[PDB]
Amino acid sequence: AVQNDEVAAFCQSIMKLKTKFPYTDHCTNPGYLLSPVTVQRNASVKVSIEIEGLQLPVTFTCDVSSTVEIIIMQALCWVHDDLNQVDVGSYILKVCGQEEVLQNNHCLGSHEHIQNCRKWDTEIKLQLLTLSAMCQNLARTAEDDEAPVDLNGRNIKEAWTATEQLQFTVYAAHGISSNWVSNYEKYYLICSLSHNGKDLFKPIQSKKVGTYKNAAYLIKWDELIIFPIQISQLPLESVLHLTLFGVLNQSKGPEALGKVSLTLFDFKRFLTCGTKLAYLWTSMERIVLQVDFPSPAFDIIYTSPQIDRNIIQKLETLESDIKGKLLDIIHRDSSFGLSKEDKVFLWENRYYCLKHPNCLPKILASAPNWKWANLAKTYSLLHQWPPLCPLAALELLDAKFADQEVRSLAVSWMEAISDDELADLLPQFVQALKYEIYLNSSLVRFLLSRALGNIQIAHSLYWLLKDALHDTHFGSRYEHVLGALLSVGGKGLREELSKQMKLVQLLGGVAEKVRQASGSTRQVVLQKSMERVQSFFLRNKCRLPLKPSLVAKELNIKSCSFFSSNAMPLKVTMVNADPLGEEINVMFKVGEDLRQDMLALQMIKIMDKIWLKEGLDLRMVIFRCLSTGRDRGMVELVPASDTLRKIQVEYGVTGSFKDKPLAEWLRKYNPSEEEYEKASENFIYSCAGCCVATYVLGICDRHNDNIMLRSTGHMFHIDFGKFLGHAQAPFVLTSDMAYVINGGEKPTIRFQLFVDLCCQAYNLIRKQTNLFLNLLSLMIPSGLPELTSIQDLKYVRDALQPQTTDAEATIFFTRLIESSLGSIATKFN
Numbered sequence: 001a002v003q004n005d006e007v008a009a010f011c012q013s014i015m016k017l018k019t020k021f022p023y024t025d026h027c028t029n030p031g032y033l034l035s036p037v038t039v040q041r042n043a044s045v046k047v048s049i050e051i052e053g054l055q056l057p058v059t060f061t062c063d064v065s066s067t068v069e070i071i072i073m074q075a076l077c078w079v080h081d082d083l084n085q086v087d088v089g090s091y092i093l094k095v096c097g098q099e100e101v102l103q104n105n106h107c108l109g110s111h112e113h114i115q116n117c118r119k120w121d122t123e124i125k126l127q128l129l130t131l132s133a134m135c136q137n138l139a140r141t142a143e144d145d146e147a148p149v150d151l152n153g154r155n156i157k158e159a160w161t162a163t164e165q166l167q168f169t170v171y172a173a174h175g176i177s178s179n180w181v182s183n184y185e186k187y188y189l190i191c192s193l194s195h196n197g198k199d200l201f202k203p204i205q206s207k208k209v210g211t212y213k214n215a216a217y218l219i220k221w222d223e224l225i226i227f228p229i230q231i232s233q234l235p236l237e238s239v240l241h242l243t244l245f246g247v248l249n250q251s252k253g254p255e256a257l258g259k260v261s262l263t264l265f266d267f268k269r270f271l272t273c274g275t276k277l278a279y280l281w282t283s284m285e286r287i288v289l290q291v292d293f294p295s296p297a298f299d300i301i302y303t304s305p306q307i308d309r310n311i312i313q314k315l316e317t318l319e320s321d322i323k324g325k326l327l328d329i330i331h332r333d334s335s336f337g338l339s340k341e342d343k344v345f346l347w348e349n350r351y352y353c354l355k356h357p358n359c360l361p362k363i364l365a366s367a368p369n370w371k372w373a374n375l376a377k378t379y380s381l382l383h384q385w386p387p388l389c390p391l392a393a394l395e396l397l398d399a400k401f402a403d404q405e406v407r408s409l410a411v412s413w414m415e416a417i418s419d420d421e422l423a424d425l426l427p428q429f430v431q432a433l434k435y436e437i438y439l440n441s442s443l444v445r446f447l448l449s450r451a452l453g454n455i456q457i458a459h460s461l462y463w464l465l466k467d468a469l470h471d472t473h474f475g476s477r478y479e480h481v482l483g484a485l486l487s488v489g490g491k492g493l494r495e496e497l498s499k500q501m502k503l504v505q506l507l508g509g510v511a512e513k514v515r516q517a518s519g520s521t522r523q524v525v526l527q528k529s530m531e532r533v534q535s536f537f538l539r540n541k542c543r544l545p546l547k548p549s550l551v552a553k554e555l556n557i558k559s560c561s562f563f564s565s566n567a568m569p570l571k572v573t574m575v576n577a578d579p580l581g582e583e584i585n586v587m588f589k590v591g592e593d594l595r596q597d598m599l600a601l602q603m604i605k606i607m608d609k610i611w612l613k614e615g616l617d618l619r620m621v622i623f624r625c626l627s628t629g630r631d632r633g634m635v636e637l638v639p640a641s642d643t644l645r646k647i648q649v650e651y652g653v654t655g656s657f658k659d660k661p662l663a664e665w666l667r668k669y670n671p672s673e674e675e676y677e678k679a680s681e682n683f684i685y686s687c688a689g690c691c692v693a694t695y696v697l698g699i700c701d702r703h704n705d706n707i708m709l710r711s712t713g714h715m716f717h718i719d720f721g722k723f724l725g726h727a728q729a730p731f732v733l734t735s736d737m738a739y740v741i742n743g744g745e746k747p748t749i750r751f752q753l754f755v756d757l758c759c760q761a762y763n764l765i766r767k768q769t770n771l772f773l774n775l776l777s778l779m780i781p782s783g784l785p786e787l788t789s790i791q792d793l794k795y796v797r798d799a800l801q802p803q804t805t806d807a808e809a810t811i812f813f814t815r816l817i818e819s820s821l822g823s824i825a826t827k828f829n
Ligand SMILES: Nc1ncnc2c1ncn2[C@@H]1O[C@H](COP(=O)(O)OP(=O)(O)OP(=O)(O)O)[C@@H](O)[C@H]1O
Pocket: 563, 565, 566, 567, 569, 623, 635, 636, 637, 638, 639, 641, 642, 643, 705, 706, 718, 719
């Protein structure tokens, strides 16, 4: 009745968000993916541009710092004597093979594709063309704009006056299973009342009751629950949690069967009255739980406290000894280990901190309470507060800040963030929706707005929301959000996402068919199971879900295979629809949850962004991984790369040195002195980044199989089964690795560089301790093995040592490296 009205009101606001995004505005409706950029502190590069009319592409050297706009008319100056009548605004640059367009107002160096090519030393192949020739099949139409949002596939009393006690009678649970009446004797509910993800009072337990007489489908309590709180004392974003328990029969402890969460105030600030039905899920099973709230002759509405139109100016009383203690906690890493006496102090001296905006999350966490009376003073500060850094504002979208005025203000500051930065943070933003109690929020409208204006964000949101549907508690919410995204995306995007969904469903079928057969059968099973994928590609041309810029037209069946390890992963080899492009090699794995692999890769990618933004390039391998369902997805295959194991055993056959397996492997593919030197250098930098990442994220499962090495010399992790396992040498540097770093059997200045890079990097991550703790905090509700409590964050905070300064931290990590060497540590200084 009110929930169907909330869905109706959501749709109407989404219908008027669509009005801001007409199909005519190419800016927000291009029809193509933008090649992603990560701003880098600014070097020459050779680029190979294909031009219409020319049979050979023009190859010239560009300044890395120079903008794509001038590189486009550098390429036009090569073909045309004078560009007075060529229409320079007509033209764009796209990556050869990949349906992604370079951003005209960004440096060539900024683009991820240019950064990657430079690292591998591969040829930068671009194509000069006009948006007329550029594929715009994903573009929204006039039909999509005019189309409505479907989303599917009298007397009032103000709350602050309401002295009535919060009470409700848990009536009954309906439709219990046959295996429930089998196992459990009696059932009881535990009722808890929370705000800012924290209990207001201890949870009240219901009486233990069996199934109702002559009705084994029904549990009837009909018990009145009374909390020791008035309606006036309830914050707006108050939530009632009901967990059902079942005591087992003598044929252990009581088992948690399911959870339910009711908002005491609805989306129009009216207190929940009369009978309300909530649905808890178990096994595909739908259990209806009835809660009867009081129903007086009047509706109780929440009204915010009258605004405090106050400006605190600028002359304030200054004490010098408090100034020291205040700026000490203002420049503290985070609000994590902040003690009670530190909070009361900051809260008292909060109005002195107005020239350090990024310390607001420390102030709001220091608040004594969120009582109705004490909200006026909080809103007064908030609405006169300077704008926060988007990455700082992330903390205000966590569980511990449920207030709508804080969250709505956090999202308003967030609008300052770029699409390219947001794109890599989307998983945390999707989880943050769980802390929005109302369907229609500032956060969901923000995400839908960016999804409309950027096809890479919309594409990423699709797969993240599709994974979030499997949440038993929040699957209902994400259903409505994904329906809003798909509806607003348009026919073009929808029809393409459907082709991607069918491909993964077919790749899923073959993947589990392959693992379910015998060794002799497997090769024949794959070749026959891939015929249904061969059929798919002859009626459809599909974009790779992992990287939707790549369009596959056909499968290279004879090149397709399996990796012959645990889970028997597939090696899907597709041919590019673009002849200018190259073969598409991806892995599809089934059985393993690839979300914790996704988080590890994300954290390593953010580390790389932080380093590159401070001018430190550790030449890191950043490969993609996407979860396309429950315990299945596809992983980017890094080309010309093997595990340290295979390299150590294959050159332990030929050599009895067991000191130069990695060295003689790199010399095989890098024979010239300068080629081996650049390969050894690539190793030093990539190894330093891996050692830092290994320690901070806590990955002790780094052995010869789990570490991989590219032929160019770049080291990178592949397995992330162990992650945040700080329950323990953290990383290991073998005699093989040391020999490559030194460039000899004795220590050189190249090891001092490796040590300098490690410590320098370690400190640049310590500077962003708050971001990492916030990004890992927001992924807690995802439900990943070893990221469940807030104590799991402390382990990462301890690794980052925010207490120490860069001097002491350098000494610590330098002793980590000396410990890492172990046996051969004696040789070094
Ligand atoms: N991102 C990648 N790029 C290139 N090759 C990869 C990548 N990920 C895995 N591989 C290759 O695929 C092989 C099998 O991968 P898989 O994930 O099954 O290995 P694992 O998790 O280390 O081992 P297991 O699954 O048997 O416990 C690896 O040994 C490696 O050679």
